[PDB]
A = this chain, B = another copy of it.
Amino acid sequence: NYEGKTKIVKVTGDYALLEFKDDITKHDVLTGKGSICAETTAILMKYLSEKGIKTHLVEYIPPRTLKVIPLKMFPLEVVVRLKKAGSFVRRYGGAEGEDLPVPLVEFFIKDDERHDPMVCVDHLEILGIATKKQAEKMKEAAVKITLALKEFFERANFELWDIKYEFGLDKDGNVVLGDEISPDTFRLRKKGFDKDVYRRDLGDPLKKYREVLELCRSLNSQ
C-alpha cells in the first residue's frame, strides 16, 4: 500500500482507501485528529465536486477513512496564496496577512529529501514531471477551487489565506484533486490576534481542527 506523513493509502480493488492518521508535523500525535481531517476533507470535496470540480472522493467512511478513486499522482504540491504568509514573507518580505492583488499559484516538487524545491512550468516540462498543458490545467483548477473555497468560508466570516493542493490523473487522464483539505493544508483566519491565536494553539492544537470541522458542518447544513 503506502504510508505518508498524515495518512495511509490502501488500494482495494478498483477504488482505494485513504485512512487519516493522528500524527502532526512540533511533530506529535493528537487524539482523534485523523477523524477530524477526514471528515472536513469529505465535506469540502463534496462541495467542490457537486460544482463540477473533479476530486478523488467517492465517499466518507467514518471515522477517518475516505473511499477514493485511484489516481496517478504528480510529485507536486500546488500552493495558492491569497494573502502574504509563511515562506512567502520569508522570501519576498511584505506584511504577513497583507492581501495579494490577485491569487498567486506556486509549484513545489514534493521531495522531502532535497526538501520541497519550488519550480516554474519550464522546470516541470524539462524534468518531465508534467506538460505545459497539464501544468496550466492544475493552475486553473487550483485557483478555481481556491476561489470556490474562499466563498465557502466567507459565509462564516473566515478568510482563506492560502492552501496547498496535489493533483493526479484518473483512468482517463483527467487532472483530479487528490490528497486532502484540512487545517493541515490551508491557513484560515477570522474575518479581519497573533498572541491570542498562538495561545490556544499552544494550549491544545486540536482546537483549531475542531473549530474548522464544526464550521464546515454548519455551512454544510444550510
Contacts and interface: CB of A to CB of B under 8 A. Distances in A.
Describe A's contact surface by its main secondary structure. Answer: mixed
Contacts of A105: 122
A123 interface: yes
B91 A104 contact: no
Given A120-B106, A120-B121, A121-B120, A114 B93 contact: yes
A92 B104 contact: no
A192 interface: no
Contacts of A62: none
Interface in A90-144: 90-94, 100-102, 104-106, 109, 111, 114, 117-123, 126-127
A100 B125 CA distance: 11
A123 B107 CA distance: 12
A92 B117 CA distance: 7
Contacts of A120: 106, 118, 120-121
Contacts of A127: 92, 94
A102 B126 contact: yes
B106 A91 contact: no
Q: Which 4 A-B pairs have the closest CB atoms?
A: A120-B120, A91-B117, A104-B126, A91-B114
Interface of A: 90-94, 100-102, 104-106, 109, 111, 114, 117-123, 126-127
